[PDB]
Amino acid sequence: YSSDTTPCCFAYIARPLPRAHIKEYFYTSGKCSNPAVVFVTRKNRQVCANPEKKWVREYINSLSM
Amino acid sequence: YSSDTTPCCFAYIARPLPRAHIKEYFYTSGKCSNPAVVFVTRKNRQVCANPEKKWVREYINSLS
């Protein structure tokens, strides 16, 4: 079993980030207690977000284009 | 409560790391389900270790 660390999220950003500031996303490991999308901003900040939220799913659909 | 990510551990390294390869350590957040020490190597690898093990406690003492 991997002994590397892996990033987990413990709170979700409450309000949508500006779409234009987001360049990438990834999901946190299923081993984490919470499911999460992490948005990577153009300043290379990583922001935890709730995968069940409509705006989060909309951003994912757009980023996957 | 921050929406930053934080590193968590899900397995512990079984064999002691070479002490000469470690530059620092930190404990993972209490928000993680498992307690852990992270040893950071000089190549910036983050290696999870079991805080209950004698070698882990010895390494922590030497780094601090």
Residue numbers in the entry:
A (entry chain A): 3 to 67
B (entry chain B): 3 to 66
The authors write:
CCL5 can oligomerize, forming dimers and oligomers of a higher order, which would complicate analysis of Evasin-4 binding. To prevent higher-order CCL5-oligomerization, the E66S CCL5 mutant was used for further experiments, as it mainly forms dimers at physiological pH. Unfortunately, several trials to crystallize Evasin-4 in complex with E66S CCL5 were unsuccessful, primarily because of the precipitation of the complex in solution, even at a low concentration. Although solubility was improved to some extent by increasing the amount of salt in the protein buffer or adding organic solvents such as glycerol, crystals that were obtained in these trials consisted of E66S CCL5 only. These crystals were used to solve the E66S CCL5 structure by X-ray crystallography. As expected, E66S CCL5 formed a dimer and had a structure very similar to that of WT CCL5 with a root-mean-square deviation (RMSD) of 0.63 Å for the backbone of the full-length protein. This confirmed that the E66S mutation disturbed neither the CCL5 folding nor the formation of a dimer. The chemical perturbation plot of monomer/dimer equilibria obtained from the 15N-1H HSQC spectrum of 20 μm E66S CCL5 at pH 4.5, showed that dimerization mostly affected residues of the N-terminal region (Ser4–Ile15), 30s loop (Ser31–Cys34), and β3-strand (Arg47–Cys50). This observation goes in line with the obtained crystal structure because the E66S CCL5 dimer interface is formed by interactions of the N terminus with the 30s loop and β3-strand. The affected residues comprised a continuous surface in the 3D structure of E66S CCL5, coinciding with the E66S CCL5 dimer interface, which suggests that binding of Evasin-4 causes disruption of the CCL5 dimer.
